[PDB]
Amino acid sequence: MIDVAIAIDAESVEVTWRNRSGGSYDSRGNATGASWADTQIRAAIQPVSGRELQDLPEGVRSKVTLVAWTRSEVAENDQIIYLGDAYRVYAARPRPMDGFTRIALGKVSP
């Protein structure tokens, strides 16, 4: 009798998964990114080295990273909207023997 992902249910939160399908290129060489599909989903987010300040000459901006451990299937280039801001997926470590993955998220807004 197997249930490991039952641990991810103790702490979770509603983040909007945003699955992506690629586009193509205009005859002039430009790029067209399209085909988003949204779905509310549950994750277990933890702040592994989040919100590092950067006082560049151009001003001040932060560097935010996170980890996910979600039950659904998420690829390497998708989006997850959490706490009102979008995060792009660095890298996933899927475990198909069970149902869950592990994801690195970086904040998109500069």
């Binding site: 792009r88 904040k107 998109v108 500069p110």
Partner: protein
């Protein structure tokens, strides 16, 4: 005086290639300052013929 060569240096900042450009602009202008100094406003000269 001159505007120099313009380069393009896109940088991967915040999960997105941020377009950037940079150049050098040089001006040219005279110098101003002021220091207090002292001045001559009189003279004195002595002339002699050694052997008359």
């Amino acid at each position: 005086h001159e505007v120099a060569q313009i380069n393009s240096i896109p940088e991967f900042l915040g999960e997105r290639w941020e377009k950037r450009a940079q150049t050098n602009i040089t001006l040219r202008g005279m110098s101003t300052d002021g220091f207090k100094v002292d001045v001559i406003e009189q003279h004195v000269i002595n002339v002699t013929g050694e052997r008359a």
